[PDB]
Each structure stands twice: as structure tokens, then as C-alpha cells.
Amino acid sequence: SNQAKADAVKEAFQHAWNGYMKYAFPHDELTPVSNGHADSRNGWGASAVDALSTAVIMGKADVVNAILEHVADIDFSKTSDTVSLFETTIRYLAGMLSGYDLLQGPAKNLVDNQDLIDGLLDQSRNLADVLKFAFDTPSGVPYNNINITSHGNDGATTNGLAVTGTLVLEWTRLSDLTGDEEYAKLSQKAESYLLKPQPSSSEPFPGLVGSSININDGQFADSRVSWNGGDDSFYEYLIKMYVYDPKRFETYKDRWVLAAESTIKHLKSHPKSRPDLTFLSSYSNRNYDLSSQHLTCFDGGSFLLGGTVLDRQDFIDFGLELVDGCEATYNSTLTKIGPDSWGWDPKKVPSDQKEFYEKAGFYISSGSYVLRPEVIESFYYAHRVTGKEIYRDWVWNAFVAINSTCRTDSGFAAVSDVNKANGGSKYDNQESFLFAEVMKYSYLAHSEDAAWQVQKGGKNTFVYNTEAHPISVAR
Numbered sequence: 001s002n003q004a005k006a007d008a009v010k011e012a013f014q015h016a017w018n019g020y021m022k023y024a025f026p027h028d029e030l031t032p033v034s035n036g037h038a039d040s041r042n043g044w045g046a047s048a049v050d051a052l053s054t055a056v057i058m059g060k061a062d063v064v065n066a067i068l069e070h071v072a073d074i075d076f077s078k079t080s081d082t083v084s085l086f087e088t089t090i091r092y093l094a095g096m097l098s099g100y101d102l103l104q105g106p107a108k109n110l111v112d113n114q115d116l117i118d119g120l121l122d123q124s125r126n127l128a129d130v131l132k133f134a135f136d137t138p139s140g141v142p143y144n145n146i147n148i149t150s151h152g153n154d155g156a157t158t159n160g161l162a163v164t165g166t167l168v169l170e171w172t173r174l175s176d177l178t179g180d181e182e183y184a185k186l187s188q189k190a191e192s193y194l195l196k197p198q199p200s201s202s203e204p205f206p207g208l209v210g211s212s213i214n215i216n217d218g219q220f221a222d223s224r225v226s227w228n229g230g231d232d233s234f235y236e237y238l239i240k241m242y243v244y245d246p247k248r249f250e251t252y253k254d255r256w257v258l259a260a261e262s263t264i265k266h267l268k269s270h271p272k273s274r275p276d277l278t279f280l281s282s283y284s285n286r287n288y289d290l291s292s293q294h295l296t297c298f299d300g301g302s303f304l305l306g307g308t309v310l311d312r313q314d315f316i317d318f319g320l321e322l323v324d325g326c327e328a329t330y331n332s333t334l335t336k337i338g339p340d341s342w343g344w345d346p347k348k349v350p351s352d353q354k355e356f357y358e359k360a361g362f363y364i365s366s367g368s369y370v371l372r373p374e375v376i377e378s379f380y381y382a383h384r385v386t387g388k389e390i391y392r393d394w395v396w397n398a399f400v401a402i403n404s405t406c407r408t409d410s411g412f413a414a415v416s417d418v419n420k421a422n423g424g425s426k427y428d429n430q431e432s433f434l435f436a437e438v439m440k441y442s443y444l445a446h447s448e449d450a451a452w453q454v455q456k457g458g459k460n461t462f463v464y465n466t467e468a469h470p471i472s473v474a475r
């Protein structure tokens with residue numbers, strides 16, 4: 001049963017790995033339709049590094065060794081493109097750190113070359129050392145888009161909420177492993193401005209903050225509240241940091257609790273046609289935006305994690321409602337995969353979607369699916385927290401739908417319309433998170449228990465970064 005299903009996910013992973021190795025390694029990614037390669041992540045081999053933690057968990061030694069040997073020859077000081085501090089941190093930094101924590105712990109018997117394992121930490125340090133100048137601003141709030149050769153930047157005056165608040169987990173982990181406090185200080189100083197928002201008008205409700213921060217003084221530049229892309233990850237890390245080290249980050253937890261409670265009281269929203277469904281809205285100056293994204297579906301998982309860790313049944317109950325809503329956007333489409341974005345504002349229901357809206361509870365704004373993992377991620381937490389089989393079935397149903405409509409001879413491709421036969425048209429794109437997230441969560445939902453699995457209460461010995469890379473907790 002679950003064993004066969006687990007093996008099935010490993011086959012899907014192996015399939016994409018073979019195609020990637022065949023036509024793109026060591027480039028950042030495989031182009032699944034033309035069977036070529038692309039480098040949207042500075043050319044250090046994003047798909048190889050992001051695939052590391054998943055391969056280790058699946059016990060694929062051949063894949064692990066190949067990736068380790070490539071990590072050893074990466075020169076993080078050279079790239080012809082500008083670098084995103086956020087993307088580089090959540091994929092590359094966390095990916096190598098994750099492999100290190102994994103291979104040094106629960107998976108110690110998988111690789112022989114201890115030198116390639118230790119090389120993971122050395123390279124993580126070299127990478128942070130090349131990127132740390134980004135934090136050298138008046139406030140400590142970094143520039144996200146930098147030029148690592150000239151030390152130049154975007155010229156930007158503000159930095160996004162998520163891009164600013166989704167660095168602390170991995171930069172602090174690097175400090176705890178190297179003994180060098182510099183990494184934690186930099187990231188935590190940047191985070192400090194988010195934990196004590198100013199002006200007060202930038203925090204409409206307790207815990208809910210604006211979407212952008214001034215680099216010059218660290219104050220918010222707007223009061224737009226949301227859990228959507230651009231904001232999401234900030235709230236996710238608030239509670240995860242607490243799981244990482246409850247002693248050092250009790251303050252993060254308090255801030256998340258406030259955010260969680262204000263979200264339930266003010267962002268909760270039900271479609272007119274389906275009062276039984278719950279989604280989250282965005283808030284800006286007393287006005288509500290009744291639309292959401294696939295990205296936002298990570299929310300149910302955040303509420304479930306904090307719920308079990310804090311033993312708050314109300315957060316758990318709410319998380320399941322968010323999970324149900326996201327599952328609704330998946331099982332209502334033709335392909336059984338959810339849309340990239342949707343709405344439920346009665347006044348804006350498109351004429352050609354009137355009847356879909358009336359029965360499904362929402363209209364599709366963007367029907368594309370770019371191999372995102374947020375819905376399966378929350379399904380995974382729901383299963384681990386409640387232990388109910390239904391949530392595991394939803395992960396499987398989604399995986400089969402993805403395997404059936406996105407699969408190409410070499411890998412998996414993004415799709416243009418989840419509400420049309422075979423997904424409409426395939427995009428010649430396969431993001432690295434296919435390896436890091438979609439395949440990991442799908443596999444974990446059906447694989448045997450282990451330390452790297454999400455646990456209930458205070459039993460977690462690993463915490464997942466935003467790219468699904470398992471990081472060992474402190475101490």
C-alpha cells in the first residue's frame with residue numbers, strides 16, 4: 001500500500017533526475033519540453049543542490065554522491081547574473097546545510113566520503129561570505145538584488161517582507177554550526193525591525209505587518225497585510241524559529257501567535273456561493289481583497305505546526321479549514337490540480353465562469369500550475385498532526401494528477417491551464433523545487449516514520465525551511 005506508493009514517488013523522482021542529468025546537469029535546470037538547460041539561479045546547479053535533501057531521505061546514494069562531487073567544484077564567487085539574496089539563501093544555503101545535518105545525523109550510513117560531507121559546511125560558509133555585504137546598509141535590512149562582483153545593488157529603497165524575513169533560519173543555523181556569530185547577528189538584526197513594527201499604522205492588527213521595509217531606516221513603507229507571495233514566508237519562519245530553539249526565540253512565537261489570532265479574526269473569509277469554504281483575504285486600509293494564490297496555501301500547514309507545538313486546538317481546527325479550502329481548488333478543476341490564483345468576490349465573477357463559481361466557490365484568475373508544492377505541503381502536515389488517512393489520500397490524488405498531466409519524456413513541466421484537458425499547453429520549465437519539495441512531501445506522506453518527519457507537540461528534531469530542506473534544531 002503506502003510502501004508501493006512511496007516507491008512510486010521515488011520512481012517519479014528518479015525519472016526527473018535521469019532527464020536532468022541527461023540533458024542539463026550541471027546547469028540550474030532542465031527545460032522539460034525541449035530537453036535542454038537553463039540557468040535561472042546563477043548557474044551553480046540549483047536542481048542538483050535542491051535535490052540533495054530529498055535524495056538523502058529517499059536513500060538514493062548514487063544521486064547523493066553525484067551531487068556532493070558537484071558541490072565541491074562550485075565557485076560561488078562567480079556568476080554572470082545578479083543574485084537574489086532570498087532565493088540563494090532558501091535553495092542553495094539551506095540545501096547544503098540540510099544535506100549536512102542529514103548526512104551527519106539520521107543518514108550517517110549513506111555516504112562514505114566524509115570529506116564531501118564536510119565540504120557542505122565549508123561551501124555554505126563560502127556562500128554566506130560572498131553574500132553578507134548585502135546586509136551592510138544603514139539599518140541592517142539588506143538589499144535583495146545584488147552584484148557579488150562589484151558589491152553593487154538594485155538601487156532599491158525598500159525590501160520586501162518575505163525576502164527580508166525568510167533568511168534567519170538558515171543564517172542562524174550556519175552560525176550555530178560554525179561557531180561564528182556574525183551570520184546570526186546580521187540576519188537577526190534585519191529581522192528585529194519586523195518583530196517591532198514602526199510606524200504603528202503599519203501594523204493594522206496585532207501581529208499583521210506591512211509588505212515592504214525602508215532600507216535606510218527599517219520602518220515599513222506600507223500597511224498592506226497579506227499571506228500571499230511576497231509576504232507569506234515571513235509568518236512561516238516566526239513559528240519555525242521557535243521550533244528551532246524555543247529558548248532563544250520565544251519572542252518569535254509570541255509574534256506568530258498574535259499574527260495567527262488576528263488572521264483568524266480578520267482575514268478569514270468565506271465565498272458567497274460556498275459559505276462552507278474558507279480562504280484568507282488581503283487587507284489594505286479597511287478594504288478587503290477577496291483573492292488568493294497557490295503560494296498562500298502554505299498557511300494551513302503553518303497553523304497546524306504552531307497548533308501542535310503550542311497545543312492550541314483552535315489553530316489546528318483553523319489550519320484544517322484552510323487545508324480543506326485549498327483541497328477544494330484542487331478537486332474542482334478538470335485535471336484535479338489547483339490554479340495559481342483565484343478569487344471569490346461576488347462583484348467580479350467573470351461571465352464565462354459564473355456557473356463554475358456558483359458550484360465551486362471561486363473563479364480562476366490564473367489557471368497555470370508551475371509545479372508548486374504548497375498544497376501538498378499542508379496536506380502533509382495535516383496528516384502528520386491528525387493522523388487521519390484522508391489527508392494522505394489527498395496528497396496521493398494530487399501526486400497522480402501531477403504525474404499524469406505534467407510528465408514529459410525527460411521530467412515534469414509547468415502547465416498553462418489546470419481546467420482544460422491535459423492542462424492545456426506545457427511550459428518549457430521545471431523549477432528546482434520540483435526536486436526539493438513536490439517529491440519530498442509526496443514521499444514523506446507515504447514513507448516510514450523517522451526523525452526528519454514532522455512530529456506533534458515538542459518532539460520535532462528537524463524543522464523544514466521554506467524550500468522543504470530539513471534543518472536540525474538547536475542543541
Ligand SMILES: *[C@@H]1O[C@H](CO)[C@@H](O[C@H]2O[C@H](CO)[C@@H](O[C@@H]3O[C@H](CO[C@H]4O[C@H](CO)[C@@H](O)[C@H](O)[C@@H]4O)[C@@H](O)[C@H](O[C@H]4O[C@H](CO)[C@@H](O)[C@H](O)[C@@H]4O)[C@@H]3O)[C@H](O)[C@H]2NC(C)=O)[C@H](O)[C@H]1NC(C)=O
Pocket residue numbers: 276277317320323324325327328331386388390
Ligand atoms: C474535495 O474538496 C472538498 C473541500 O475540501 C472536500 O470536502 C470535505 O473535506 C473534508 C473531508 O474530511 C471535510 O472535513 C470534515 O468535515 C466534517 C463534517 O463537517 C460538517 O459538520 C461540522 C459539525 O461540527 C460543521 O462544523 C461543518 O461546517 C460541516 O457542516 C467534520 O466532522 C470533520 O471533522 C472531524 O475530523 C477532523 C479531522 O479530519 C477533526 O479535526 C475534527 O475534530 C473532527 O473529528 C472534518 O472537518 C469537509 O467538511 C468537506 N468540505 C466540504 C465543504 O464539503 C472533499 O472531500 C474533496 N473531495 C474529494 C473526492 O477529494
Ligand SMILES: *[C@@H]1O[C@H](CO)[C@@H](O[C@H]2O[C@H](CO)[C@@H](O)[C@H](O)[C@H]2NC(C)=O)[C@H](O)[C@H]1NC(C)=O
Pocket residue numbers: 080081082147148149150152
Ligand atoms: C556586476 O558588476 C560588474 C562590475 O565589476 C559588471 O562587470 C562588467 O561591467 C561592464 C558591463 O558591461 C563591462 O565592463 C564588463 O562587461 C564587465 N566588467 C567588469 C567590471 O568586470 C557586471 O556586468 C555586473 N553584473 C551584472 C550583469 O549586473
Ligand SMILES: *[C@@H]1O[C@H](CO)[C@@H](O[C@H]2O[C@H](CO)[C@@H](O)[C@H](O)[C@H]2NC(C)=O)[C@H](O)[C@H]1NC(C)=O
Pocket residue numbers: 008400403404407
Ligand atoms: C506516472 O506516470 C508514469 C508514466 O506514464 C507511469 O509509469 C508507466 O511506465 C510505463 C510507461 O511509461 C508503463 O509501465 C505504464 O504505462 C506505467 N507503469 C505501470 C504502472 O505499468 C506511473 O505508473 C505513473 N505513476 C503513478 C503511480 O500513477
Ligand SMILES: OC[C@H]1NC[C@@H](O)[C@@H](O)[C@@H]1O
Pocket residue numbers: 233295372373374433437466467468
Ligand atoms: O512555489 C514555490 C517557490 N517559492 C516560494 C518559496 O518559499 C519556495 O517554496 C519555492 O522557491
Ligand SMILES: [Ca+2]
Pocket residue numbers: 298465466467468
Ligand atoms: Ca515555501
